[PDB]
Design a protein around this nucleic acid. Structure first.
Ligand SMILES: [Mg+2]
Ligand SMILES: [Mg+2]
Ligand SMILES: [Mg+2]
Ligand SMILES: [Mg+2]
Ligand SMILES: [Mg+2]
Ligand SMILES: [Mg+2]
Ligand SMILES: [Mg+2]
Ligand SMILES: [Mg+2]
Ligand SMILES: [Mg+2]
Ligand SMILES: [Mg+2]
Ligand SMILES: [Mg+2]
Ligand SMILES: [Mg+2]
Ligand SMILES: [Mg+2]
Ligand SMILES: [Mg+2]
Ligand SMILES: [Mg+2]
Ligand SMILES: [Mg+2]
Ligand SMILES: [Mg+2]
Ligand SMILES: [Mg+2]
Ligand SMILES: [Mg+2]
Ligand SMILES: [Mg+2]
Ligand SMILES: [Mg+2]
Ligand SMILES: [Mg+2]
Ligand SMILES: [Mg+2]
Ligand SMILES: [Mg+2]
Ligand SMILES: [Mg+2]
Ligand SMILES: [Mg+2]
Ligand SMILES: [Mg+2]
Ligand SMILES: [Mg+2]
Ligand SMILES: [Mg+2]
Ligand SMILES: [Mg+2]
Ligand SMILES: [Mg+2]
Ligand SMILES: [Mg+2]
Ligand SMILES: [Mg+2]
Ligand SMILES: [Mg+2]
Ligand SMILES: [Mg+2]
Ligand SMILES: [Mg+2]
Ligand SMILES: [Mg+2]
Ligand SMILES: [Mg+2]
Ligand SMILES: [Mg+2]
Ligand SMILES: [Mg+2]
Ligand SMILES: [Mg+2]
Ligand SMILES: [Mg+2]
Ligand SMILES: [Mg+2]
Ligand SMILES: [Mg+2]
Ligand SMILES: [Mg+2]
Ligand SMILES: [Mg+2]
Ligand SMILES: [Mg+2]
Ligand SMILES: [Mg+2]
Ligand SMILES: [Mg+2]
Ligand SMILES: [Mg+2]
Ligand SMILES: [Mg+2]
Ligand SMILES: [Mg+2]
Ligand SMILES: [Mg+2]
Ligand SMILES: [Mg+2]
Ligand SMILES: [Mg+2]
Ligand SMILES: [Mg+2]
Ligand SMILES: [Mg+2]
Ligand SMILES: [Mg+2]
Ligand SMILES: [Mg+2]
Ligand SMILES: [Mg+2]
Ligand SMILES: [Mg+2]
Ligand SMILES: [Mg+2]
Ligand SMILES: [Mg+2]
Ligand SMILES: [Mg+2]
Ligand SMILES: [Mg+2]
Ligand SMILES: [Mg+2]
Ligand SMILES: [Mg+2]
Ligand SMILES: [Mg+2]
Ligand SMILES: [Mg+2]
Ligand SMILES: [Mg+2]
Ligand SMILES: [Mg+2]
Ligand SMILES: [Mg+2]
Ligand SMILES: [Mg+2]
Ligand SMILES: [Mg+2]
Ligand SMILES: [Mg+2]
Ligand SMILES: [Mg+2]
Ligand SMILES: [Mg+2]
Ligand SMILES: [Mg+2]
Ligand SMILES: [Mg+2]
Ligand SMILES: [Mg+2]
Ligand SMILES: [Mg+2]
Ligand SMILES: [Mg+2]
Ligand SMILES: [Mg+2]
Ligand SMILES: [Mg+2]
Ligand SMILES: [Mg+2]
Ligand SMILES: [Mg+2]
Ligand SMILES: [Mg+2]
Ligand SMILES: [Mg+2]
Ligand SMILES: [Mg+2]
Ligand SMILES: [Mg+2]
Ligand SMILES: [Mg+2]
Ligand SMILES: [Mg+2]
Ligand SMILES: [Mg+2]
Ligand SMILES: [Mg+2]
Ligand SMILES: [Mg+2]
Ligand SMILES: [Mg+2]
Ligand SMILES: [Mg+2]
Ligand SMILES: [Mg+2]
Ligand SMILES: [Mg+2]
Ligand SMILES: [Mg+2]
Ligand SMILES: [Mg+2]
Ligand SMILES: [Mg+2]
Ligand SMILES: [Mg+2]
Ligand SMILES: [Mg+2]
Ligand SMILES: [Mg+2]
Ligand SMILES: [Mg+2]
Ligand SMILES: [Mg+2]
Ligand SMILES: [Mg+2]
Ligand SMILES: [Mg+2]
Ligand SMILES: [Mg+2]
Ligand SMILES: [Mg+2]
Ligand SMILES: [Mg+2]
Ligand SMILES: [Mg+2]
Ligand SMILES: [Mg+2]
Ligand SMILES: [Mg+2]
Ligand SMILES: [Mg+2]
Ligand SMILES: [Mg+2]
Ligand SMILES: [Mg+2]
Ligand SMILES: [Mg+2]
Ligand SMILES: [Mg+2]
Ligand SMILES: [Mg+2]
Ligand SMILES: [Mg+2]
Ligand SMILES: [Mg+2]
Ligand SMILES: [Mg+2]
Ligand SMILES: [Mg+2]
Ligand SMILES: [Mg+2]
Ligand SMILES: [Mg+2]
Ligand SMILES: [Mg+2]
Ligand SMILES: [Mg+2]
Ligand SMILES: [Mg+2]
Ligand SMILES: [Mg+2]
Ligand SMILES: [Mg+2]
Ligand SMILES: [Zn+2]
Lengths: 140, 37, 204, 174, 12
RNA sequence: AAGUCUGGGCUAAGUGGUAAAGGAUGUGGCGCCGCGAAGACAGCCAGCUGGUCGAGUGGCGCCGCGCCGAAAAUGAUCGGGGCUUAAGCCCAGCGCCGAAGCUGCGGGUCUGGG
RNA sequence: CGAUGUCGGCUCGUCGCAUCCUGGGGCUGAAGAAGGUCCCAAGGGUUGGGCUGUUCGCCCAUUAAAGCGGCACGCGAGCUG
RNA sequence: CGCUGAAAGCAUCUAAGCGGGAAGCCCGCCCCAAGAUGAGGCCUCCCACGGCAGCCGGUAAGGACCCGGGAAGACCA
């Protein structure tokens, strides 16, 4: 007998209210959903995990002094081109980037991992535009 | 302000305060003001 | 903000209070508004201006349509001014009175492939004392094994000019509305006959 | 040896309403809200407010005394109100009112004009005494501090803006 | 600074 | 790949995740003395004793974990994301994952015994 | 060692900060002005000449200042020699 | 450098909270920029062709080729 490999299935859409949740600990679960490792027919070389919609990403929560002390970084290729941005400011300007960077780092590197990240839809504010897909509310 | 590794009371009116992660010594005598560093 | 399209016509000096003042003459008017960008519709605020009349025999169907919805004779050049919303449906040089300072944008003259000396004012090499075929060369372009590469942005030979340039805070010296003329003190980018933009200045 | 557990006399008639994490103190001179730790419980007894803490560990003791004074100051605020006086020592130096605003003439090349913020009132008796008065104690202290800063006491001469009841310690010159 | 050369110059 | 496993404690520095003499009302825990309902310490009224105040207060030492001392050159980082009754540290457990080690099954060859 | 071309200059920079100047401070045996000394700060700036192959240094005339270091004592498939 | 303020009846810029404060940091100015594959937006134009998410045939709006040139330019653009 050879191991079961699934034919393509309809992917599940899914909703998560990020409000008051701890950045990293939420991130971990979103990644799992994304990889689809909650599914007994999990297959490592195809995209068969869920689509994950997140709302209230601006109301993510963080412990210690990471608001002032956590630094996001960007190198431009140019001399002196390392930009440093604190959590506080990232939230004040692009709050969904906070959760986006977090999940992205916990996805695999490579062509598949990048596809999985595209299946993450993160939103600041309580609304999202995907009522069409009718995502299923998740408690995490 | 004096900035040293060893900040100490200099007179009986000196006071060892600690603010914002740093040890200071404040006092009536401006010469005795110290910050550890 | 306020602005207008125009062509640079040429330079002179005039006399004012027993002073010679260098001027560039700009033919600015008249510019019909042909579309307005609104926050409800476009997400920002601006006016699409038209400039210079065009032979309708040259204006294709998608363009013809655009003009028509605005009821405007076909025009040769279409350009936007941001955060500017004039009462009328035609912008003329009269939005500027003498004494105002403006910012002028044009397309700088094109020097094509420019050596490192013309482009970046490098010093080049010596012209005697042994200099070997390096008189206009740039010298070293790096270090050694650390970092073992050349920085992004390293000033080097390459094309120069024919690029957008805005010089700022030019005095409006006069305006001659019966002829759509603006007199601006000093120098404006680009050749005579070049299209320019004249906006109200951003300096204080 | 303790501040938080000393009870707060409440004059007649100021009211004290308790809410989670804040208490509101109304009186003859206005209202003021005191944000308060949810860990602390404020108690409304007859003619009296008390604050109680839930343990005897460090953070809680520290919050305890703080909260009692915080509310005590609010009470006194809407009753008696708060004020600080400034003395203006120095020959050229004088002050005057211009409408609600304060005009300091203290030896610069210009005069300085301080605008009273909300809840703050300026008074000039002599031209060398200024009174900052309001119901908010920390706001009165602030503005007062602000005013003094315009020309702090010299170290060498009895000149500048002084706190009333501020010593005039000086040092010699050559 | 002035240290002795470790290589000679050239040839053919 | 397998525990957001259980129970007790410490740490608030992202310490953990780069260092010393030394310095310090950081924090928790011990211990030892001095003074005090014959009224101490602190404030308000004097001259180290008085007066109301009505409780503790002041000093020495030890242990755990932290703080400073801590400046270097291309762009940063504990491997990364990220982690704070922890995803850190100490003590005690149960379970799992994990190698070409061990076992199961099948085969080869040499050697030894039949 | 079946080759990693070696001082100095020139050209072109770029980085560090133990900061020369400019900005903000505290103490001063800080009257004022001007200094001392420490702290924060690397954004920009940091001159022309005489001597010597010189780096360095001395010297002349200025300057807000005339910083010190790293980049194979930065840079000879860039030049000089 | 402060305001208010406990632990610690005093005091304390700090443990709750709030101020002021650099040529430096973020925005602001100028220029590039949707290959920003996360490939955005608006205005206008064409239109529903014939034959067995594919193939072939002719067109539409438009585009290219060619030519006269150009303060655009090495060719290209
Ligand atoms: Mg949490
Ligand atoms: Mg969660
Ligand atoms: Mg799950
Ligand atoms: Mg939380
Ligand atoms: Mg924080
Ligand atoms: Mg670089
Ligand atoms: Mg830069
Ligand atoms: Mg750097
Ligand atoms: Mg940058
Ligand atoms: Mg977020
Ligand atoms: Mg010292
Ligand atoms: Mg010092
Ligand atoms: Mg000493
Ligand atoms: Mg002593
Ligand atoms: Mg601070
Ligand atoms: Mg003191
Ligand atoms: Mg706009
Ligand atoms: Mg806008
Ligand atoms: Mg916008
Ligand atoms: Mg506008
Ligand atoms: Mg040439
Ligand atoms: Mg030239
Ligand atoms: Mg040039
Ligand atoms: Mg030149
Ligand atoms: Mg030269
Ligand atoms: Mg030359
Ligand atoms: Mg030269
Ligand atoms: Mg030669
Ligand atoms: Mg030659
Ligand atoms: Mg390299
Ligand atoms: Mg470039
Ligand atoms: Mg270049
Ligand atoms: Mg060009
Ligand atoms: Mg512009
Ligand atoms: Mg001017
Ligand atoms: Mg001017
Ligand atoms: Mg005139
Ligand atoms: Mg243009
Ligand atoms: Mg209690
Ligand atoms: Mg006071
Ligand atoms: Mg004050
Ligand atoms: Mg102030
Ligand atoms: Mg006072
Ligand atoms: Mg004297
Ligand atoms: Mg657990
Ligand atoms: Mg620290
Ligand atoms: Mg760390
Ligand atoms: Mg560390
Ligand atoms: Mg030792
Ligand atoms: Mg030690
Ligand atoms: Mg000691
Ligand atoms: Mg202790
Ligand atoms: Mg200890
Ligand atoms: Mg007593
Ligand atoms: Mg006596
Ligand atoms: Mg440290
Ligand atoms: Mg530093
Ligand atoms: Mg690991
Ligand atoms: Mg535990
Ligand atoms: Mg195995
Ligand atoms: Mg084996
Ligand atoms: Mg076997
Ligand atoms: Mg054998
Ligand atoms: Mg046999
Ligand atoms: Mg060799
Ligand atoms: Mg060789
Ligand atoms: Mg070789
Ligand atoms: Mg030279
Ligand atoms: Mg030379
Ligand atoms: Mg030369
Ligand atoms: Mg460099
Ligand atoms: Mg430099
Ligand atoms: Mg560094
Ligand atoms: Mg740096
Ligand atoms: Mg420094
Ligand atoms: Mg030093
Ligand atoms: Mg020094
Ligand atoms: Mg300075
Ligand atoms: Mg200065
Ligand atoms: Mg100074
Ligand atoms: Mg003196
Ligand atoms: Mg002075
Ligand atoms: Mg003097
Ligand atoms: Mg010293
Ligand atoms: Mg000084
Ligand atoms: Mg020195
Ligand atoms: Mg600098
Ligand atoms: Mg430098
Ligand atoms: Mg020179
Ligand atoms: Mg020289
Ligand atoms: Mg000579
Ligand atoms: Mg010379
Ligand atoms: Mg010579
Ligand atoms: Mg020399
Ligand atoms: Mg010498
Ligand atoms: Mg000077
Ligand atoms: Mg010199
Ligand atoms: Mg240097
Ligand atoms: Mg250098
Ligand atoms: Mg070396
Ligand atoms: Mg060198
Ligand atoms: Mg070298
Ligand atoms: Mg070399
Ligand atoms: Mg050579
Ligand atoms: Mg050489
Ligand atoms: Mg080389
Ligand atoms: Mg080479
Ligand atoms: Mg060269
Ligand atoms: Mg020779
Ligand atoms: Mg006070
Ligand atoms: Mg008090
Ligand atoms: Mg008190
Ligand atoms: Mg605080
Ligand atoms: Mg704390
Ligand atoms: Mg502040
Ligand atoms: Mg400036
Ligand atoms: Mg553009
Ligand atoms: Mg696009
Ligand atoms: Mg674009
Ligand atoms: Mg990307
Ligand atoms: Mg798309
Ligand atoms: Mg598009
Ligand atoms: Mg848009
Ligand atoms: Mg349009
Ligand atoms: Mg048709
Ligand atoms: Mg039809
Ligand atoms: Mg068809
Ligand atoms: Mg058919
Ligand atoms: Mg056609
Ligand atoms: Mg050209
Ligand atoms: Mg041509
Ligand atoms: Mg062609
Ligand atoms: Zn002292």
């Amino acid at each position: 007998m050879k191991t079961y490999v699934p034919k393509q299935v309809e992917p599940r859409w899914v909703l998560i209210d990020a409000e008051g949740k701890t950045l990293g600990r939420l991130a971990t679960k979103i990644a799992t959903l994304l990889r689809g490792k909650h599914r007994p027919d999990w297959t490592p070389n195809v995209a068969m995990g869920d689509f994950v919609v997140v709302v209230n990403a601006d109301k993510i929560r963080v412990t210690g002094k990471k608001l002032e002390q956590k630094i996001y970084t960007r190198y431009s290729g140019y001399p002196g081109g390392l930009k440093k941005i604190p959590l506080e400011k990232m939230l004040a300007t692009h709050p969904e980037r906070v959760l986006e960077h977090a999940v992205k780092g916990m996805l695999p590197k490579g062509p598949l991992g990048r596809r999985l990240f595209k299946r993450l839809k993160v939103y600041a504010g309580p609304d999202h535009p995907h009522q069409a897909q009718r995502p299923e509310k998740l408690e995490v | 302000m004096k900035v040293r590794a060893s900040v100490k009371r200099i007179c009986d009116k000196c006071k060892v305060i600690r603010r914002h992660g740093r040890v200071y010594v404040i006092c009536e005598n401006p010469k005795h003001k110290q910050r550890q560093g | 903000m306020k602005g207008i399209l125009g062509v640079k016509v040429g330079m002179t000096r005039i006399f004012r209070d027993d002073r010679a003042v260098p001027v560039t003459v700009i033919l600015a008017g008249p510019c019909p508004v042909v579309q307005r960008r609104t926050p409800e519709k476009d997400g920002y605020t601006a006016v699409q201006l038209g400039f210079l009349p065009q032979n309708p025999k040259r204006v294709n169907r998608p363009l013809k349509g655009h003009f028509a919805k605005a009821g405007v004779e076909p025009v040769r050049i279409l350009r936007e001014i941001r955060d500017f919303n004039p009462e009328g449906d035609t912008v003329t040089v009269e939005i500027f009175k003498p004494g105002e300072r403006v910012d002028v944008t044009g397309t700088s003259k094109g020097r094509g492939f420019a050596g490192v000396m013309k482009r970046w004012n490098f010093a080049g090499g010596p012209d005697s004392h042994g200099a070997h075929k390096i008189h206009r060369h740039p010298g070293s372009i790096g270090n050694r094994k650390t970092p073992g590469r050349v920085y992004k942005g390293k000033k080097m030979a390459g094309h120069y000019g024919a690029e957008r340039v805005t010089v700022m805070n030019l005095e409006v010296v006069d305006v001659i509305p019966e002829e759509n003329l603006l007199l601006v003190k000093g120098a404006v980018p680009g050749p005579n006959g070049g299209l320019v933009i004249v906006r109200e200045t951003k300096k204080a | 040896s303790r501040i938080g557990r000393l009870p707060i006399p409440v004059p007649k008639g100021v009211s004290v309403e308790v809410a989670p994490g804040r208490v509101k103190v109304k009186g003859p001179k206005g209202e003021l809200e005191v944000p308060v730790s949810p860990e602390m419980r404020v108690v409304v007894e007859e003619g009296v407010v008390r604050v109680e803490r839930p343990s005897d560990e460090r953070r809680h003791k520290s919050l305890h005394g703080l909260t009692r004074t915080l509310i005590a100051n609010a009470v006194k605020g809407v009753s008696e109100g708060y004020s600080k006086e400034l003395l203006i020592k120095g020959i050229g130096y004088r002050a005057r009112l211009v409408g609600r605003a304060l005009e300091l003439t203290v030896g610069f090349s210009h005069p300085v004009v301080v605008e009273p913020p909300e809840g703050i009132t300026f008074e000039v008796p002599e031209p060398t005494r200024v009174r900052v008065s309001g119901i908010d104690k920390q706001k009165v202290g602030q503005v007062a501090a602000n005013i003094r800063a315009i020309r702090k006491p010299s170290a060498y001469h009895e000149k500048g803006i002084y706190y009333a009841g501020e010593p005039v310690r000086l040092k010699p010159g050559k | 600074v002035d240290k002795p050369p470790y290589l000679p110059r050239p040839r053919p």
